[PDB]
Amino acid sequence: NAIKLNGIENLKVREIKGLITAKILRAQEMNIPISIEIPDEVSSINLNMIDLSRSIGIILDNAIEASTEIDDPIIRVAFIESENSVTFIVMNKCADDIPRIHELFQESFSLGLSTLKEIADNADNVLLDTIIENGFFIQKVEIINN
């Protein structure tokens, strides 16, 4: 195993805990090191449980799937509290394997990234970003409080 715990107790949205636990253990089943970083307390997220669960599941599954052909994989998972939002961020090491990320897009839009996009498009408080940066694939959902 390799699981780094960095504020797990700060996640106080109970309904997604089992989901996150299950995905983290799946990552481990497949020998992918995983980091969970929650710097501040997160006691509510302004997105309904259905879309929040689905988005978290898809994003973590994307990161796991994208990490299986990688030599020295790692997944970082974060929930970041801002003044007016909560951001869920997952990064996986893709190194130079851009084709793997392209494959993700190909499959989803030829129900992973497409479901995710549909949730974000239908919710005015939800911003979705996808970024390749410094050898990591980054999936980011910011969920605005107002």
Is residue 83 a contact point for its own copies (CB under 8 A)? Answer: no
Q: What angle do CA 143, 100, 90 make, to 5 degrees?
A: 25
Output the smallest distance, CB 107 to its own copies, in A.
Answer: 12
Only segment of 16-24, 83-91, 100-108, 119-127 that touches its own copies (CB under 8 A)? 16-24
Q: Are 42 and 12 in contact (CB under 8 A)?
A: yes
Output the smallest distance, CB 105 to its own copies, in A.
Answer: 17
**Alpha-carbon dihedral sign for residues 58, 135, 28, 88:** negative
Selected binder of its own copies within 29, 40, 107, 121 (CB under 8 A): 29
Taking CB under 8 A as the criterion, which residues in 38-57 touch its own copies? 49-50, 52-54, 56-57
Taking CB under 8 A as the criterion, which residues in 122-141 touch its own copies? none
Which residues of the chain form contacts with its own copies (CB under 8 A)? Answer: 14-19, 21-22, 25-26, 29, 49-50, 52-54, 56-57, 111, 115
